Amino acid sequence: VKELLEAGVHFGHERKRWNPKFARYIYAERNGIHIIDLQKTMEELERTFRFIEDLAMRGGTILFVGTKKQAQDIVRMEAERAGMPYVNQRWLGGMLTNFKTISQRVHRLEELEALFAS
RNA sequence: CGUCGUCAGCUCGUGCCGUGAGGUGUUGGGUUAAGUCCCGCAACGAGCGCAACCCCCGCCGUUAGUUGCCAGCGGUUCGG
Ligand SMILES: [Mg+2]
Ligand SMILES: [Mg+2]
Ligand SMILES: [Mg+2]
Fold this sequence. Notes:
The chain is mainly alpha-helical. Helix content is about 40%, strand content about 5%.
């Protein structure tokens, strides 16, 4: 019910542009495309999802980062529905390490939403 | 105080990179008088600069008329 759908379009990408440390999961090469194996894919999906199901109800927050044209609005839609923050548009330089500084930009957003209804 | 020159610049906080000096921000294309602004961006902002806030000169209005003008019967030293 997982790989029945994951075998839809959700596997098989970039030809001859490959980071070869990813070759654990890389299955074959047909029409140039490095097709990715689905078995280790789904077990690695469980390895992620066990951690997500732990640290998602432990008060832990997920930060959904996606910048390409392909993954913009389907990150923006599915990111706001668990309270989890996202970056739909260009994710800036140091939102995380410089978080205490970009908190000032969030507060300027709040003190500008004060100036909207003003 | 003159000067580079009213020239568009010089920086900082924090983050990143770099052993380090130091970058980055401030590069790039566009744009203006301008580091002016926006689009991308390891940058996000901020400070002094620029601009604007000041004043004159421009037009119009309100108030005010011992300057000002004939519109007015009309004096008339016959002259604002
Ligand atoms: Mg500096
Ligand atoms: Mg270091
Ligand atoms: Mg400036």
